Amino acid sequence: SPGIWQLDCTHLEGKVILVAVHVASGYIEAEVIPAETGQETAYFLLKLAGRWPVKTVHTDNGSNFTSTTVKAACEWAGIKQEFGNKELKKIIGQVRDQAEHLKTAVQMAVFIHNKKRKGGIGGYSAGERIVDIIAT
Amino acid sequence: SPGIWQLDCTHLEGKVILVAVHVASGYIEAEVIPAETGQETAYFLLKLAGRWPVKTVHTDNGSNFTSTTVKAACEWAGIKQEFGNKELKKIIGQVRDQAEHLKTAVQMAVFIHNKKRKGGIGGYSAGERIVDIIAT
Numbered sequence: 001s002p003g004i005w006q007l008d009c010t011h012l013e014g015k016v017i018l019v020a021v022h023v024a025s026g027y028i029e030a031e032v033i034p035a036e037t038g039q040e041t042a043y044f045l046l047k048l049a050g051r052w053p054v055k056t057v058h059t060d061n062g063s064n065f066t067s068t069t070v071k072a073a074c075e076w077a078g079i080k081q082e083f084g085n086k087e088l089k090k091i092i093g094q095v096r097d098q099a100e101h102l103k104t105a106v107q108m109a110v111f112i113h114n115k116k117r118k119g120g121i122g123g124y125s126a127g128e129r130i131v132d133i134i135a136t
Numbered sequence: 137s138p139g140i141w142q143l144d145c146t147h148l149e150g151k152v153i154l155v156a157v158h159v160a161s162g163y164i165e166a167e168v169i170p171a172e173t174g175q176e177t178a179y180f181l182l183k184l185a186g187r188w189p190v191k192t193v194h195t196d197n198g199s200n201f202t203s204t205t206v207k208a209a210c211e212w213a214g215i216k217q218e219f220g221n222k223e224l225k226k227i228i229g230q231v232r233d234q235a236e237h238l239k240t241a242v243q244m245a246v247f248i249h250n251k252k253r254k255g256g257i258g259g260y261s262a263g264e265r266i267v268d269i270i271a272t
């Protein structure tokens with residue numbers, strides 16, 4: 001569907017990388033947080049939902065169902081939380097020393113994941129795909 | 137054009153709100169930063185450019201032309217920096233006490249600006265407009 005998203009954790013240099021995937025397109029948004037609190041998760045969902053149609057967020061774990069802020073962010077924004085890739089880390093390792101902060105390398109790797117052509121040569125990007133789907 | 141953006145400062149509770157406007161659509165993205173450094177500006181541009189087509193960023197002032205990080209972010213991302221609205225603050229004042237941090241109210245106000253129908257009743261939203269333009 002157009003507004004389906006998958007939310008995930010990944011970890012690096014002892015920080016948490018939050019990743020949202022638009023399932024139909026492959027487009028990603030990521031943010032690095034100091035700590036894995038639900039407060040930070042809730043602000044990232046709020047930003048996401050103001051930038052895109054965010055109807056349903058899937059999570060693999062239980063941590064998102066026990067944060068009152070997240071619950072209140074989803075209600076205000078109209079997000080359905082429901083229970084039930086890592087080329088990213090390859091690219092972060094490529095750029096990691098051409099900028100100091102990990103967060104920057106993450107966002108450089110998000111840039112590349114979203115903009116490249118899905119697989120190399122020919123097709124659309126994750127970022128083209130998401131706009132198309134939503135246009136319809 | 138599709139990738140034209142306007143970048144602006146606004147201020148509230150003694151913090152800086154960075155605002156990017158997609159000129160053709162009216163869509164906005166905003167971030168609150170501790171300090172007005174170019175480092176923070178450069179990370180916000182990097183995130184923006186990984187989420188959307190960002191070809192040209194207009195600024196009203198000179199502060200962006202004197203930050204080496206911003207200059208290096210634009211070059212890496214392919215952004216042309218060139219030299220040459222505030223319903224936002226109205227909405228931040230409406231929500232400001234239904235959440236603690238200013239940043240949240242900003243993002244709630246961004247959500248509303250982007251999602252509402254441009255003027256009330258009938259039309260498209262800023263957020264629909266931007267996707268349409270880019271689809272084409």
Ligand SMILES: O=C(O)Cc1coc2ccc(-c3cccc(F)c3)cc12
Pocket residue numbers: 098099100101102104175176178179180182205208209212213
């Ligand atoms: O490096 C850091 O941690 C500081 C920093 C904060 O926001 C940024 C956005 C972009 C770049 C950058 C620098 C050089 C080449 C390049 F392609 C990108 C750096 C930063």
Ligand SMILES: O=C(O)Cc1coc2ccc(-c3cccc(F)c3)cc12
Pocket residue numbers: 039040042043044046069072073076077234235236237238240
């Ligand atoms: O409040 C704060 O500063 C903490 C906070 C950080 O990220 C957030 C994202 C969303 C909400 C929230 C809370 C209640 C109603 C609502 F519509 C939204 C709060 C926060």
